[PDB]
């Protein structure tokens, strides 16, 4: 999710923030970008079950 697209930082001199942008110039690949990955994606490796004696 959010990583299926091809986005690269436009660079440092185009008057735009350095976040990754799609070919058109659309913000991508970040928590703050619409369509971007979760900053820390939720995962099934969480221990769902605890232990009791």
């Amino acid at each position: 999710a959010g990583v299926q697209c091809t986005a690269h930082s436009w660079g440092p001199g185009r008057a735009v923030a350095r976040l990754p942008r799609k070919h058109g110039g659309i913000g991508a690949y970040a928590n703050f970008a619409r369509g971007g990955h979760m900053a820390h994606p939720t995962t099934v490796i969480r221990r769902w079950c605890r232990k009791v004696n």
Binding site: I45, W48, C49
Partner: protein, 203 residues
């Protein structure tokens, strides 16, 4: 009892008589093509040891492999990157030239299944090996309980999956016990079973 004598005559490979016979053959083989259909095994005793039976659906082909070390295919000889990974001539193939001979006859004839191969002759330039291949759709083979397993679909192009004797040697499967405990289901599979993180429920 004849085949006992041939096994011992063929243990004397540098014998004056075998030397003439193997010089005459290494000349003939050089004159022919790399993969050649042979009307019969040239080595009947070794073919019979490795399975060949003189019935229909049993074919022998001689494959010629070029002798020598490998040169990595990198343009201009340059393999960029880390210095350990440099070096293009003098590298050594990971599979015997016997295994290559069986992979070469598999590609030329993908309609046949490979059983086993044996050394026939060598020169400084080339080494010749004869491969016994089986037609898995012949009536005699399908109905013969001894070779009927070659007709199973899971034995399709066995050389391409390292399942012939020479491929098995190159995968380290002739060795068993200490030395071979990280190459048993497969080298790749052992690494995957060792490096798996279990993450059980009641961890």
């Amino acid at each position: 009892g004849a085949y006992k004598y041939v096994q011992e005559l063929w243990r004397k490979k540098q014998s004056e008589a075998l030397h003439y016979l193997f010089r005459l053959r290494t000349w003939e083989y050089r004159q022919l093509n790399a993969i050649k259909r042979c009307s019969h095994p040239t080595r009947p005793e070794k073919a019979r040891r490795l399975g060949y039976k003189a019935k229909r659906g049993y074919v022998v082909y001689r494959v010629r492999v070029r002798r020598g070390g490998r040169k990595r295919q990198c343009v201009h000889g340059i393999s960029y990157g880390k210095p350990r990974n440099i070096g293009i001539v003098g590298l050594k193939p990971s599979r015997s030239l016997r295994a290559l001979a069986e992979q070469k006859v598999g590609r030329r004839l993908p309609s046949l299944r490979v059983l086993n191969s044996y050394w026939v002759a060598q020169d400084g330039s080339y080494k010749w090996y004869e491969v016994i291949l089986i037609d898995p759709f012949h009536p005699w083979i399908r109905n013969d309980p001894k070779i009927n397993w070659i007709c199973n679909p899971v034995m399709k192009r066995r050389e391409c999956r390292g399942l012939t004797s020479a491929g098995r040697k190159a995968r380290g499967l002739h060795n068993k016990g200490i030395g071979a405990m990280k190459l048993r289901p497969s080298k790749r599979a052992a690494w995957k079973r060792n490096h798996t993180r279990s993450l059980r429920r009641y961890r």
